[PDB]
């Protein structure tokens, strides 16, 4: 999300008050990229679509052993 910060009167140096200048205002943005190149990986089967295991359990996301 964009953010904006504005100085408060307690942080303006006395010199800038004489010159009447405000600075250190800060903004933040994120740019959105377009798409240029795309790659495809096609596959043509000949005899039978590849079979899959009958393991109907939910696929675990991590290994129990961690040492």
- Binding footprint of other proteins on the chain (CB under 8 A): 32-46, 48-52
Beta-bridge partner residues of 5: 26
Angstrom distance (rounded) from CA 67 to CA 55: 27
- For the CB of residue 45, give the shortest distance to other proteins in the complex, in Å: 5
Residue 19 or 42 having the CB closest to other proteins: 42
CA atoms within 13 A of residue 31's CA, in its CB half-sphere? 2
Residue 33 or 57 having the CB closest to other proteins: 33
- For the CB of residue 54, give the shortest distance to other proteins in the complex, in Å: 10
For the beta carbon of residue 16, count every other beta carbon within 10 angstroms.
Answer: 14
Residue 10 or 44 having the CB closest to other proteins: 44
């Amino acid at each position: 999300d964009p953010t904006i910060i504005i100085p408060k009167r307690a942080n303006i140096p006395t010199n800038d008050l004489a010159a009447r200048i405000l600075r250190d205002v800060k903004v933040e943005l994120v740019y959105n990229n377009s798409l240029h190149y795309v790659k495809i990986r096609a596959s043509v089967v000949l005899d039978r679509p590849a079979g899959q295991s009958t393991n109907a359990q939910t696929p675990m996301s991590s290994s129990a052993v961690g040492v």
